[PDB]
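For the sake of transparency, this paper describes our internal protein records without simplification. Because each token names a local backbone shape, the row as a whole describes the fold. One such record is reproduced below, unchanged from the form in which we store it:
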Amino acid sequence: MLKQVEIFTDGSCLGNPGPGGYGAILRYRGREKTFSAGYTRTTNNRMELMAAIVALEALKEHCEVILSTDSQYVRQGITQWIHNWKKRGWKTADAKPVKNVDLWQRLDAALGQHQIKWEWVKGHAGHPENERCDELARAAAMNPTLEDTGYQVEV
């Protein structure tokens, strides 16, 4: 039985906007939980954030997590954006709400319940779980069943 929660995530989308999906694998307690769903009209970026959201929200107590993903967008948000956005009240320099504020706020709330170690993998050098994420993400996008409520051509 692992002593650290392990999460792997991926998101995919066929257009901008277009049908997209996510795949997330979670090794929690003594199980391997697999999440995956497709959305009718969304973006690659929103799917990559959704992956991480759904895996963390599945956690019911404070855990020590290791999250592995090749997502550049999640990476930039976490290492260069988030800290600064919290200080500015989640606004851009032209005073508007940041893009995908809905999801970043949601991610942010899930993050602050845990001790997280981020593992930035390269697309072509991930583990077998990251490849599975990708395959699930892709399949989900081909058969969308949910609405991505927070999406805007806008704000």
